[PDB]
Structure formats: C-alpha cells, structure tokens
C-alpha cells in the first residue's frame, strides 16, 4: 500500500532498456572523444551552492537538515561538484575532459519531460580557453544526439555572453549591462511583456527594436557583423567555432541572439540543441563558464561543457520511434517430460560462456506456458530439452521470431545458436 | 580562497577511481544479464514508512531522513529491497518468475568511525516467485560468477546455513527460544571461548550440544557430514544437498556449511549464504538468502524471494589487494601537430578513427611536441598521430607506438586502416 513519492519514477525492465541505451550511447561517444568518467557525492552542504552566478538551480533544491543539524541538499546539478574536484588536481596536465551521468534532483512540479529526479549526462573540458574546446563539446553533443537516432530533429543554436554583453552596450550604456535575464524569457513570455520589461529597464525604442529583431528567429553569423558590431573579436570566434564544427561534420549550426541559458555562470559561448518539431526548446545545452572555478576556490580554470537529461531524451526516442538495438541474443531453455535441472544448468553455462544471455525454466509449468513465458520475455531462441529426444542426444531449438524449429545434436547446440 | 569540502563519509571518484567502479558495474551487470536477470531502477527517495515493516526504529535511525511538506517522513534509500518489493507488488501483469537486478547508490547516516562511507554503490540480484532449490542455486551461482569474472576466483568460499536447519538443531538441544542461542552464536567471533561456553550453558544446553556448537562454529562442514553430525535426515538437509548438487552443475564446488552464519535469521525464511574471504580480512564479501515473508507483510500478496547484495567498497579493496588487471574496451589515439596545421584536418581524421571503433583525443592547446607526448602518455594513449606541416605536403603523417616508442611515416590514405591493424 505504501506508494512512491509523487514526481519520482520507477524503472521496470522495459523502462531500463531505454535508459541503458541512453547511458551506453552517451558514455561511448564521450569516451570516443577522449572524455573520462567521474562521479561525486549525491548529497552536499547547501552552502556549497551559495555562489554568485550559481543561484539558478538553488531555486528548486531538495534540501533539508541532516540529523546533525547542518543544511544539506541532494545535488541539483553536477557542475559545482565537478569544479571542486577539478581545482583539487593541480597535478593533472591540461586539458581535463571529464563526463558524468549522475542522478540530480529538483523539487519542481512534474510535467511531460520532467520529474523531481532524473539522470543527467555531463561533459566538460577544463583548462583550454580555445575555440577548439567550444567546438569539441558541441560536436560531442551532436554525436550523441545522432547515435541516439535523433539526427534530424535538432538544430544547434549558439550565442555568446560577450557578443550579447557588448551589443547591449554598443548602443545603450545603461549600467544594467546584464538585461540577460530579460532576453532569457523571450521564448517564455508574451512579446508585449518582453518589450516593456526591457523598456522598463531603461532602453530606447531603437534599442528595444533591434533587441527584439535580433531575438526573432535564428540568423546567420556572417550577417551579425553587419546588423551590429563591425567585426568584434567574439564574432570572429563564433565564426571560427562554426568552421571547426563543419570539420567534425556538424553543419547548419545557427546564431541565435535569444540563446542565453538560465544558469548565470556562463561567460562565453552558450548553446542548445533546439527541437525542430517545437516540443522542447532545449533538448540539451551548455556553454563556457570561465569564472566558476575562481569563485569557488580562487583557482582560475577555463571551462566549457553541457548537460543532457534522460527524461526529455526518452520522450524523443519514443516520439521518433527509435529502434533500441539489443547487444546479445537471449536463449530460453525449456523442459518437457522428466528432465534434470542440472543438465539444463550445464548447457546454460556453456551458452553463456560464448556470449549469450540464458534464462532457465525453474517453474513447474507446461511447455505451452513455457513458450508463452519465453516470448513474453523476448527470448530469441528456445532450446527445448525433451526426456525422450535427450535419450537420442537431441534437443529442439525454436526460433522465437521466425517460428522455425529443428532438432539439434547436443554437441552442435552451442555452434548452431551462435550461427542463429 | 577557501572551499566548502564534501560531507565527511562521502567519496569523490576521479577518472582512475571510476576505472575500477566501471569494471565492477560492467562485470556485475553482464553476469546478471547472462543469467537472464533484467535491470531495474527506482527512486533514491522513499517514504520512511516503507522501511518500518522490515526494520525497527532502532535501525531506522541510521537513515538520511527528514520531514516532508505534509509532515510526512521521507529518506534517502538505505537499501534496495523494499523499493524492489514495492515494484513487484505494484504491477500485477508481471509474469513469473522475475529475475531483477539493480545497482544504485544507497545512503546511511553513520559516523566515519567504522571504516565505511555514508554513500556507496549497492548491487542487488533477486528471483521473485519461485520457492525451489533451483532458485537458491541460481542466485548463488550468479554471485560466484560475478566474483570469478571480477578476477576474485580463488579468494572466496561460499558458506551456507539455514533458518529451518538452525531451528531443528537448536530445538533439539533446548526448549527455550532458539533466537536467544542464535545471539550467542552471533557473538562467537567477539567474546572468549571460555565466555562462549558459559553463555551456551546458561541457555540450558548440555555439554552435549555445547560441544557440537563450539565445534561447528570453529570449522565449516560439508553438506554430507550434517545428516550424521546432527543425527537426523530432515527435508531441510536434503534441500541443501539438492542445492549443492545444482551448484555443481553450474561449476560451483567446495560449498561449505557454516553453522555460525546467523545474522538476519529473523529476516530470512530459508537458505542464507555468504562469500567468505580466505585471507580472512572480510567475513562476508557479499551475501543474502531467501526471504519469502517480506512481500506479504508489505503488500499482503505472497511472494517467494531469494537474492544477494554486494557493496562496491569491499570489492574495490579486494581488486587492489589481489592486484587484478582491468581490461580496456578500446584502443586510444592522441592526435597533435607541430608547425602550422589546421585543427580541421585533425578533427576530420579523429572522426574517421572514432567511426572505426577507436577512442580519440585531439590536442587543443598550444604547446611543444615534448609536452604533447608527455600528455599522450599521461592519458595512456596507445598511439600518437603527429601532423607536421612539411610532412603533410608529402601526404604523410608520423605515427608512434606509445609503448614501443618507435614511429613510422604513414600516408594519410592509410592512417585509419593502419591503426586498426596495429595492436600495440
């Protein structure tokens, strides 16, 4: 009768087939780009997040007072824990390419694509302030989205905190230099409120006008110099990043002045994989945050990376009807008539030692129920031991898929299956 | 500047650390799945009420618990079973039997005193829906398989006991409550041999049984000896012989009967087992047993259950102790340049190498060749591809075997195929 806290999920086998696929694809891709896995505690002291620029996720922390009187919280994100670890390894030659895939928590109201607990992949490069670093992490994100079977549903949209901190300064020197909070909601709120929020910030008509025009849709990077800022340095960097992206095979990336990102520790490039169908604005996203390390430890460490939650990916995988591949072939071993479990165990052992997943019948059920069960668990083959056929050193192998059956010599069972 | 450290009792896992953890996860998962078990997961937070059925307020004090909005107590899960059981009894379309395994984190609010951690990866494998020898054996076989595949074969010994067995043997020596004696037996490795006897003799046990208990706790016995040592041939001893026989067909031999395994006997309803460390450093590397009554108490629905648990910490110490060599899935390649060379040409080839099953790390920082090779070595790359502008004009690139130290020129057109064939 005791139920699970609402907002949390249970993962039955079929649900985990999907999650595992997400874990495998993310991990294999990251390692292919040279990233190495790390992990950190799931609980931290709340004071860890009391940092200027890292106050966005502190808004929904699953915090509480341990029985020791101190305030703690389930981690809402992985970045600060990762940074604390980075600044503790001055022995490691740069760059540092680390990735993680921990659970993170957030006390928010559930909805299509979000729970209070989820698996979040993270990949970050520490130590390099180069365009190559910005491009590599974005290339890794695309690679993952592609290998997941989502290659045609997203668009890579980029921008930069420098490009957007000078534009709204190359016209309006209004000290509220970071109207960034306003632009972040451009796609959330209505156009009228957006125009007056920025207007009540102390921006002239021409300013509000261009800012609105710049936010409207995605544009080319090359035209950016034109429509504003005659070839600054950050614009040239974005161009370089675009070119570098093409070399990895990543194309159609687009500039979008409305791409800001919620987290406030971003200082350079910011990006998101936009869902072309319009269901999710950010399937994944990240950027460069060259000041977090200093703020937390006093050591300056350039950083660029991104995050990807499992919930939204699960939805897309289903929506786009992706086919989750199956690693090993599974064999279900049945029994009809009087047959010792021992001999079945012996052969299951032999099949396993040759790379196959084998499930043995242990229930006192008939052959009809056995095959029903075999099909219910998705076995690829059914090896049926029959008391009489065993006398003649024969066993029946059924192809659960085709429906085909054949008798097979005991000493040809292993090889016959391996050849399907 | 100063830093807020992580909570005492918790661990950070650096790349080198995760190399070990990944091998444990991978080995456990593949073995479990090879036996037909299927992975599941569940919330890391549950209502504290979920644990009250199987544990008392005393044990429930070591949980990372707290009060929820509606004044409801919730906790970071201290173990996996109650959650797993709740899932078994929350969906009624589930076939039978159910072979499920999980490997999430679990938390325990305990002081860093007893060399442990407040958080660790806990692996659990259980068979639900079958009260048979076959099930008892499969679970134990799976545990052995995992220990052997971890490179820990030869250091552990499977030791089994049984509640029904202990009751028959104790009941035949005294009429008082059996558990009062299980407690003493439970103190066998803590008190003195002289004090042990006194306690056994205070519970109404003659020199007769007192002698058999002391002997039995001093050494393990074969399943055979039991029928005679206890002078009885009950159905329970045959059940264990039946299990031993089934284990043999799985390749699991030298199973021992250990009378002293009594912890949890109030929880378990049938067989219980542990993987004992020969080097006598850890009494139980992993373990479990049958607990056919938990499901009923939790849902009202009767559900036989057998399984075992295994922590990452102790496995981690054993791997180091036995100096186990951990394999590397793929070959690693580092690509760098000397002289002016476009980053794009390096990206192009790393993509081609990755699409061919290799892990590739491209140099993205400005630094001399010597420092680059030092870096390649630090990350354990197997090969380094050196792009030199002059050499590129001639269509060649230098490739060095990071282990041999040698290097050959290779045509761009053959870099991929060349590395693919090279095996260090």
């Amino acid at each position: 009768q005791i139920e699970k806290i609402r907002g949390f999920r249970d993962f039955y086998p079929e649900d985990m087939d999907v999650e595992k696929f997400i874990f495998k694809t993310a991990e294999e891709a990251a390692e292919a780009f040279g990233f190495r896995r790390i992990d950190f505690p799931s609980l931290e002291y709340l004071d860890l997040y009391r940092i200027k620029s890292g106050e966005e996720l502190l808004q929904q922390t699953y915090s509480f007072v341990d029985k020791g009187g101190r305030e703690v919280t389930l981690i809402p994100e992985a970045t600060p824990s990762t940074v604390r670890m980075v600044t503790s390894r001055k022995d490691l030659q740069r760059p540092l390419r680390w990735y993680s895939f921990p659970k993170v928590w957030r006390y928010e109201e559930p909805q299509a694509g979000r729970y209070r607990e989820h698996y979040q992949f993270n990949a970050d490069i520490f130590g390099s302030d180069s365009p190559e670093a910005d491009a590599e992490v974005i290339a890794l994100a695309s690679s993952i989205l592609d290998r997941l079977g989502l290659q045609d549903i997203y668009e890579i949209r980029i921008n930069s905190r420098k490009i957007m901190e000078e534009i709204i300064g190359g016209m309006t020197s209004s000290d509220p230099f970071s109207v960034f909070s306003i632009i972040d909601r451009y796609h959330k709120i209505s156009r009228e409120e957006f125009v007056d929020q920025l207007r009540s910030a102390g921006i002239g008509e021409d300013g509000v006008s261009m800012i609105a025009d710049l936010c409207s849709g995605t544009r080319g990077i090359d035209e950016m110099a034109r429509i504003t800022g005659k070839s600054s340095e950050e614009i040239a960097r974005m161009a370089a990043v675009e070119d570098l992206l093409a070399s990895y095979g990543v194309k159609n990336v687009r500039y979008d002045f409305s791409i800001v990102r919620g987290l406030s520790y971003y200082t350079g490039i910011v990006f998101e994989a936009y869902d072309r169908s319009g269901q999710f604005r950010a399937i994944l996203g990240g950027g460069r945050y060259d000041n977090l390390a200093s703020l937390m430890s006093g050591e300056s460490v350039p950083a660029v990376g991104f995050g990807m939650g499992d919930a939204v990916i699960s939805l897309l995988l289903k929506r786009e009807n992706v086919q989750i591949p199956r690693e090993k072939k599974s064999v279900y071993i049945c029994r009809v008539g009087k047959i010792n479990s021992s001999i079945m165990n012996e052969y299951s052992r032999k099949l396993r030692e040759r790379g196959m997943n084998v499930t043995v019948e242990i229930m006192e059920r008939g052959l009809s129920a056995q095959l029903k069960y075999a099909s219910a668990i998705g076995a690829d083959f059914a090896v049926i031991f029959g008391e009489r056929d065993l006398e003649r050193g024969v066993v029946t192998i059924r192809n659960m898929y085709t429906g085909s059956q054949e008798n097979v010599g005991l000493d040809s069972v292993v090889e016959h299956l391996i050849s399907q």
Side-chain angles (χ1 to χ4, degrees), chain A:
Chain A
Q1 43 179 56
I2 291 175
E3 307 185 311
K4 64 174 166 63
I5 303 175
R6 202 155 196 176
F8 287 74
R9 294 168 296 175
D10 275 330
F11 294 93
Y12 287 81
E14 40 287 293
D15 298 317
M16 283 304 291
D17 289 327
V18 174
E19 293 296 330
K20 287 172 61 199
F21 174 57
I22 305 188
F23 297 163
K24 186 178 188 300
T25 305
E27 282 149 41
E28 284 176 22
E31 281 168 36
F33 273 68
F35 288 62
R36 299 185 64 193
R37 185 166 181 186
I38 57 156
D39 198 21
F40 29 82
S42 297
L43 195 71
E44 287 288 340
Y45 280 130
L46 189 54
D47 292 338
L48 176 66
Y49 301 99
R50 298 301 191 194
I51 295 297
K52 180 176 52 53
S53 293
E55 67 207 68
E56 267 53 294
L57 277 177
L58 201 44
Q59 303 168 176
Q60 56 219 303
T61 62
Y62 237 106
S63 45
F64 63 99
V65 186
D66 63 21
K67 285 187 286 63
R70 305 181 178 184
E71 291 183 307
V72 295
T73 177
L74 277 164
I75 60 171
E77 66 174 311
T79 307
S81 300
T82 300
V83 169
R84 177 216 290 150
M85 282 173 59
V86 167
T87 55
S88 297
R89 293 305 294 285
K90 294 180 180 65
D91 62 301
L92 290 172
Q93 178 175 25
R94 269 58 175 160
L96 266 48
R97 280 181 244 251
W98 292 351
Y99 83 85
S100 65
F101 210 153
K103 279 186 171 181
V104 301
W105 297 260
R106 304 185 187 189
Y107 194 101
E108 65 193 313
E109 284 307 301
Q111 236 309 297
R114 51 206 301 177
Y115 305 77
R116 294 170 174 180
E117 174 187 292
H118 66 92
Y119 282 107
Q120 186 188 65
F121 173 90
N122 285 277
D124 303 80
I125 300 182
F126 299 100
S128 172
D129 204 82
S130 72
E132 282 77 5
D134 297 349
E136 188 175 301
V137 306
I138 289 181
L140 170 50
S142 297
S143 176
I144 286 178
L145 289 182
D146 289 1
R147 287 175 166 178
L148 285 174
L150 306 174
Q151 51 271 74
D152 303 301
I153 72 167
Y154 72 91
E155 170 183 71
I156 293 302
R157 295 177 175 184
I158 68 177
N159 183 22
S160 173
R161 292 308 186 83
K162 288 197 196 307
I163 287 181
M164 70 181 282
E165 90 157 301
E166 73 183 57
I167 287 180
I168 67 175
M171 44 178 232
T172 172
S173 297
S174 56
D175 281 271
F177 293 166
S178 58
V179 304
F180 291 28
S181 192
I182 302 172
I183 297 170
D184 172 60
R185 286 171 295 185
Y186 175 72
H187 287 132
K188 297 186 179 68
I189 67 183
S190 66
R191 186 75 64 268
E192 262 302 308
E193 171 181 50
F194 177 68
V195 177
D196 287 303
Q197 280 197 55
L198 204 65
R199 173 164 287 151
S200 54
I203 302 181
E205 294 299 298
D206 305 59
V208 177
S209 178
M210 182 173 85
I211 297 179
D213 302 321
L214 242 33
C215 286
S216 185
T218 61
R219 248 175 223 54
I221 64 164
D222 291 40
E223 198 68 292
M224 272 307 289
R226 172 249 182 290
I227 56 183
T228 176
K230 185 186 65 178
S231 301
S232 61
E233 193 168 305
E234 192 63 24
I235 300 183
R237 184 194 177 90
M238 293 297 95
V241 171
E242 288 217 329
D243 292 314
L244 288 169
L245 264 334
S247 71
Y248 282 93
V250 181
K251 302 180 299 300
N252 302 315
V253 329
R254 263 168 289 292
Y255 181 77
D256 191 326
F257 190 70
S258 69
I259 293 284
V260 183
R261 286 270 84 189
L263 287 44
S264 50
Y265 52 64
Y266 289 122
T267 58
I269 189 176
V270 291
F271 70 102
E272 314 189 317
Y274 176 75
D275 171 40
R276 290 174 174 298
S277 290
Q279 198 181 330
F280 311 92
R281 183 161 299 293
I283 298 168
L284 57 68
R288 170 178 292 290
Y289 50 106
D290 295 351
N291 290 178
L292 219 207
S294 295
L295 287 176
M296 292 180 93
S297 72
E299 190 195 333
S300 175
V301 183
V304 64
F306 70 92
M308 185 189 81
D310 82 287
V312 180
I313 292 302
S314 296
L315 292 187
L316 286 168
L317 245 29
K318 255 61 78 62
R319 196 191 70 180
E320 299 304 314
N321 296 86
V322 179
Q323 299 302 293
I324 313 299
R326 189 199 300 186
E327 293 295 295
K328 302 189 175 186
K329 62 186 65 186
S330 49
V331 186
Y332 190 71
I333 294 176
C334 312
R335 71 203 308 189
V336 63
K338 184 177 184 175
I339 285 179
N340 311 62
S341 295
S342 60
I343 193 180
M344 293 185 283
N345 291 344
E346 282 170 47
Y347 276 85
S348 70
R349 174 185 182 185
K350 299 176 174 174
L351 292 183
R352 285 162 186 155
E353 300 204 57
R354 289 309 300 291
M356 292 186 275
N357 293 159
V358 183
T359 299
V360 178
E361 180 61 79
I362 62 178
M363 307 278 57
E364 196 282 303
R365 33 151 68 120
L367 218 216
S368 183
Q370 284 175 45
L371 286 179
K372 239 72 166 301
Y373 180 73
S375 180
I377 65 166
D380 297 301
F381 298 106
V383 177
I384 308 172
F385 283 76
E387 168 166 32
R388 277 191 174 295
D389 287 40
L390 192 289
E391 307 271 50
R392 295 179 280 86
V394 166
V395 98
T396 302
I397 299 182
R398 133 119 74 173
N399 182 297
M400 298 304 284
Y401 273 35
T402 63
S404 158
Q405 303 192 334
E406 295 296 313
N407 282 318
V408 185
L410 277 175
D411 301 317
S412 270
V413 175
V414 179
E415 292 304 310
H416 178 68
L417 271 309
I418 293 182
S419 56
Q420 175 165 47

